[PDB]
């Protein structure tokens, strides 16, 4: 059996799998108060992509399609295409187009467009509100609020590039986005389907280990914390390697290569998430060259050294 | 010696190493008329990063720092920090900060900022003109044109997220960007140093093979072609594997997994670029599931089968 491995990359060398930004830090905290069911950054250790997860770090929270103006507004409806501009297949066994945002919030970035006939181009700031009833990416349709009332043309390739998140400063601060609330990918037309499962640690004394970034904020007082369950590079790696899983739990050690010392150990579950033995909120203190190293497959009874 | 490999990824599954967008296609053409000296997407087969190359594609053409308004304008100077908000170190023997744009052009995106004290945020469309006199990233400062003259605060973390490119003026359509012209990283009076080498075919009948994307256009009639010498995923892979180069030339075959048949072969040079045996400009026609496979190290005298 091909030996399982994780990448030799530091945290700061890696990328969030839920928004196209670098990782910053490792965080652990209790998660009983919410449902942890992200759909990006979901992959088994033997390389099966789950949810809306795809390989490209730059395609996370991007959309592509054609747009139609909503008369009397600055809003546009986008009829989605696939990430390579092929027709979007709404019958694929996924919750939504690959890379669709997996949280309720207002995501700001730019819409850009090229006129096929002559190579003329145009671009405008735009925001997608993933909690609104017009956010129906599984159906192939979403809406953007933009800074134009007439510039985008119909029947022309149009891309949304995400930048960051927005909040309404008149509501309680940091009340949005809600990173652990999934959109309704078909709006009010249907329930979510083909979801990667919710994750919840149940081994005594364990919490999830989160790979954390701070999303750019574009307006108001947003909650900019964004926690993913796997770095994007781990998704990419497992997809490549497809190493057989011996058991349901891979034991990783986080090591300082300068000293050889183990800082902590953690469980990488076959279904694609990480737990540590800790209780409470904690920003992990790690050396700048530290990285994760797979050491062995362990059984259901294995108890981690306390963090 | 660890066996050398390239990733099992299709072209469309991979990412441009010179701008944070997917690859679309393969292109070969004669390159005698310009200097091919990109600084991003530069890496040896045994994993030594070159030029301004760093590992995650989402950091390419991003900038971070604090900003100051230029009175009487809508322009801001950005005092650059490192990607993790440490001080930027201009004394490193690299051409410019890692991920700095390596073409002359006007790159549009958004500047975003968070006020540390209260978490208030703001974001504005912004353009950096990498050919202008203020573009001195090696020295630690650049200028942006924005749509505000008063909104950004001093002394606060500010990020530029790139989206695409712009063209305007009385010059010919597609006269900018100029993807094979490096910026003057230290200014218009300055000289670029510590560059990754210029590359050229050195065997009769050979041309470079380019990994091509189309950059989003944000205004006007820009030249949106962007050719890199290595997919970002190959940079990431070689850095991981660090497999010793047994010769100066790795022979790759491009394979159709549906049939197992080799479509063409190419040379992956140890110093990090690819050639094919072909004369003239050609958009390669490939099956969408096709991928590159390392077959053997060859000597300097190997003659490729015509593409």
UniProtKB/TrEMBL annotation, chains A, B:
The keyword Cytoplasm belongs to this UniProt entry's keyword annotation: no
Protein's UniProt keywords contain Disulfide bond: no
Domain Calicivirus coat protein C-terminal: 82-307
Signal peptide location: none
Subcellular location: Host cytoplasm; Virion
Annotated keywords: Host cytoplasm, Virion
Cellular component annotations (GO), alphabetically ordered: host cell cytoplasm; virion component
Protein name: Major capsid protein
Species name: Norovirus Hu/GII.4/Farmington Hills/2004/USA
